[PDB]
Every structure is written in structure tokens, then in C-alpha cells.
T-cell receptor
Framework: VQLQESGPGLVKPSETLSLTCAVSGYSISSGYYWGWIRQPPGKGLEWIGSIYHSGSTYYNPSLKSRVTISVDTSKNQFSLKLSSVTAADTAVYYCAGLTNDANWGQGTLTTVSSASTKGPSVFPLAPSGTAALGCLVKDYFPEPVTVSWNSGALTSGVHTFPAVLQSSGLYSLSSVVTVPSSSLGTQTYICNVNHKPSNTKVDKKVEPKSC | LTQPPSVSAAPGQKVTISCSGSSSNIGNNYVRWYQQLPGTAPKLLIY???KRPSGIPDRFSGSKSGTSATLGITGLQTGDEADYYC??????????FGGGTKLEIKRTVAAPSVFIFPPSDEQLKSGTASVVCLLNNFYPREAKVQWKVDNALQSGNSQESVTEQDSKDSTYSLSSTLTLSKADYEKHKVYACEVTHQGLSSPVTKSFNRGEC
């Protein structure tokens, strides 16, 4: 059983947030319930609402007037609509359901902001018996970006930092890896950057500099 | 539902994490516990106050007493670094959650390895300069970075961020980025990052001169 959220990462103030949860490997009719729980950045969990076997729904009283949860049997998915959003609704949204152990989706960040989507520029952090190298993923909005190295083949020694919000209102993120200095001449290092809100994907080779 | 914001202990040791509720939530209802590794969804550890799902080792246990509940974790491992949440139901039988407790693993002091990176020519051509200082694999978390440009202390034009505790060696890493315009970057020669950490007997400086690369 796999759950997967999808939906816009950016919503404008006063507009409606819409998310869908695709349920694979299990039928929506056979679940005890399906529901949504959110987590504002750096904070705890807040239940939004659930829809049960019969179709009966229960919502968080502080959100009820703004929440709709529905099931689409034909597409085997369920949905969340949260109307009239504000910055207070910025959060990672999780779909969840019970088929004791509830299944969770991977979560999707939704930012509520008047700012617009902007794709990143990717710059190398070139290395010149351990060497450090990396990629600077600069000036994007909203979060998140994902970074891998050598298409996932390189994971040892990788550190991908939390994004920082610049005074410009755009994010920047660094991802680094430490490798043997003797490898720099023969091993290729590529950072794979994905910013889904702007549909920006970049594979950047980080080459040792001439110093 | 309140829990403490953090707890810490060395590998091999035990911790407990308490969840304080009321007569109408924990007092009347079952308690569940969740582990949330960084970047992942919560995972069920304990249900019905004290039962473990298949797949959860008996290093984890739960109990309930009155309006409070407790999660115990014995034989702490570096993999246990995570946010831990209690969950129960309120007077309307809707789910409610605690605020989460972050578990830190104590390890031996480790000095950072420091690296400095000039701006790429690629970025300079776009009109901006980011100078990056990396502090790699240190413990504990507290660390100070001071930027100097031609011996001028830089104050207010840098930002830093720190990784979550490493799942394998329990260290932190930190990156600091100094922002300058291209015109300002080309006005100066010596760019230096000075690092202070309890693992270092005296501060460590990494520097470069503009134009070496």
C-alpha cells in the first residue's frame, strides 16, 4: 500500500488549496478511513479531517468551514480542498489512511504566498587526503529543491543543508560531499537538482578548478 | 498534550519521553507514539498504549498512567535520532498530537574540518558573489564563523544553516555563505573564514586571494 500526495506547492492568499492523494495497492472502499494531517515547518502535527468507510466526514472544528474531503473511487484517490488560505496554512500536508498501522504519504509542502514561482540557478562549489565539493542552488521560490549526487549512486559523505531564506525573499541551498582527493582526476561528480514548482531540473558537473 | 522539546543521551543508554495530557484526551483514550526521521512521514512505534507493530524492536516501549503517557527507548543507536510524537484522541474522538521531542545522540567531541570556496566565475558573470565556508562533521552543535574581507569583520551579510545530526556518526555540518555584489567582490583581495569550536584548541582560518583561481 502506497500513498502519494500531489498538488501545487504554491497557493495565493485567499485562494483555495487543492491536494490529491493517489492510493496504490489498495482500494479506497476498503479503508477504515482516509484523511489529512499537516505540519507547519519546524512545528508539530495538526489533524485536518477524515472520511470514513460509509463516506461520513469529520473535520477539525477550527478549520471546518474551509475544508472538503472527497473520495474518487474511479481513480482510487481522495482529495483535500482548503479554501481562503493564508500564510498560516503554509505546511507539509500528509495524506493518511487505515487499511492498527496507518499508511502515510510522503508529504507535500504547500507555501501560501503572494510571491511567484522562480527556478534556481546552479553554481559549482569546485574542489581545487580529503576534498570537499558541492553545488550552490540559488534564488528559487518556493521550497523545496531536491539534490542528489551522481544520480543517487553517491550518498556517502553527502550533506544537503536546510535552505536559507535570503533578504531578497528567495531561497538558497548548498549541497556538499567529501571525497578522496586522489579521485578528483578520474571520477566525475554531478549534482542533480530538481525544483518541481518551476519544473526546473539541472545536472551540473562539478569540475576541479585551475588554481 | 505537551512533551519536552528535546532529550539526549549516549549510545547504549536509555531515555524516556513523556506526554502530559488531560482527563479528556489521554485520561480516557488510547495513546500512540510515532518516530519521524528527518524529511520522512511519522512512523508508528506504539499503539494501544503499549503494543508494538511488527517491525518495531523491543528497545521501544510505551506505558500510560492517568493523564500521562511515556515512551521509553533503550540501547540507543545513532539511527534513533528523530522527532518523537505522542498521539491520542480528544473529547470528540478526533486525533490530537504532542508537540514533538527531538532526540539527540551524545558522542565524543569532534572538531570541524573547514573548507572555503570562492564564487564561481559562472556566478560572477551573472553579477553576484557567494563565498562559502563549510564546517564538516563536528560535535557538539555550537560553532562560530567569522568572515573577514581584507581584514574587515563582516557583520550582517552572511547566512548559515546546519544539518540534522548525521544518522551514522552523529555529527553536524554547517555552511556559511557570505554575499557580496560583483563590484564589491572585485574591490578586495583576501577572503577569510575563521572557525571557533570546542574541538579546536584555537580558531582555524581558511582563506583565499581573489585571482588565484
Amino acid at each position: 500500500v502506497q500513498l502519494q500526495e500531489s498538488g501545487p506547492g504554491l497557493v495565493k492568499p485567499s485562494e483555495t488549496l487543492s491536494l490529491t492523494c493517489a492510493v496504490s495497492g489498495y482500494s479506497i472502499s476498503s479503508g477504515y478511513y482516509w484523511g489529512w494531517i499537516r505540519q507547519p515547518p519546524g512545528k508539530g502535527l495538526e489533524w485536518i479531517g477524515s472520511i470514513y468507510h460509509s463516506g461520513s466526514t469529520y473535520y477539525n472544528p477550527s478549520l471546518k468551514s474551509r475544508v472538503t474531503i472527497s473520495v474518487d473511487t474511479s481513480k482510487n484517490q481522495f482529495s483535500l480542498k482548503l479554501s481562503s488560505v493564508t500564510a498560516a496554512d503554509t505546511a507539509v500536508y500528509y495524506c493518511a489512511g487505515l487499511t492498527n498501522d496507518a499508511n502515510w504519504g510522503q508529504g507535500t509542502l504547500t507555501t501560501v504566498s503572494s510571491a511567484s514561482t522562480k527556478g534556481p540557478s546552479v553554481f559549482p562549489l569546485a574542489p581545487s587526503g580529503t576534498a570537499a565539493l558541492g553545488c550552490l542552488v540559488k534564488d528559487y521560490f518556493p521550497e523545496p529543491v531536491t539534490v542528489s549526487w551522481n544520480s543517487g549512486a553517491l550518498t556517502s559523505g553527502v550533506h544537503t543543508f536546510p535552505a536559507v531564506l535570503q533578504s531578497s525573499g528567495l531561497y538558497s541551498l548548498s549541497s556538499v560531499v567529501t571525497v578522496p582527493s586522489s579521485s578528483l582526476g578520474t571520477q566525475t561528480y554531478i549534482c542533480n537538482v530538481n525544483h518541481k514548482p518551476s519544473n526546473t531540473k539541472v545536472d551540473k558537473k562539478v569540475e576541479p578548478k585551475s588554481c | 498534550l505537551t512533551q519536552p522539546p528535546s532529550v539526549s543521551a549516549a549510545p547504549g543508554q536509555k531515555v524516556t519521553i513523556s506526554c502530559s495530557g488531560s482527563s479528556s484526551n489521554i485520561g480516557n483514550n488510547y495513546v500512540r507514539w510515532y518516530q519521524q526521521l528527518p524529511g520522512t512521514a511519522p512512523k508508528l512505534l506504539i499503539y494501544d498504549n503499549n503494543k508494538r507493530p511488527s517491525g518495531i524492536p523491543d528497545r521501544f516501549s510505551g506505558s500510560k498512567s492517568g493523564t500521562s503517557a511515556t515512551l521509553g527507548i533503550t540501547g540507543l543507536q545513532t539511527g534513533d535520532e528523530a522527532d518523537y510524537y505522542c498521539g491520542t484522541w480528544d473529547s470528540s474522538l478526533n486525533p490530537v498530537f504532542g508537540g514533538g521531542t527531538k532526540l539527540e545522540i551524545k558522542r565524543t567531541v569532534a572538531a570541524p574540518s573547514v573548507f572555503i570556496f570562492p564564487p564561481s566565475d559562472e556566478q560572477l558573470k551573472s553579477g553576484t558573489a557567494s563565498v562559502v565556508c563549510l564546517l564538516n562533521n563536528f560535535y557538539p552543535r555550537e560553532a562560530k564563523v567569522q568572515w573577514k574581507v581584507d581584514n574587515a569583520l563582516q557583520s550582517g551579510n552572511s547566512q548559515e544553516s546546519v544539518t540534522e545530526q548525521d544518522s551514522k556518526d552523529s555529527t553536524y555540518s554547517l555552511s556559511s555563505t557570505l554575499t557580496l555584489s560583483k563590484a564589491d567582490y572585485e574591490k578586495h583581495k583576501v577572503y577569510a573564514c575563521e572557525v571557533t569550536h570546542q574541538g579546536l584548541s584555537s580558531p582555524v582560518t581558511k582563506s583565499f586571494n581573489r585571482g588565484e583561481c
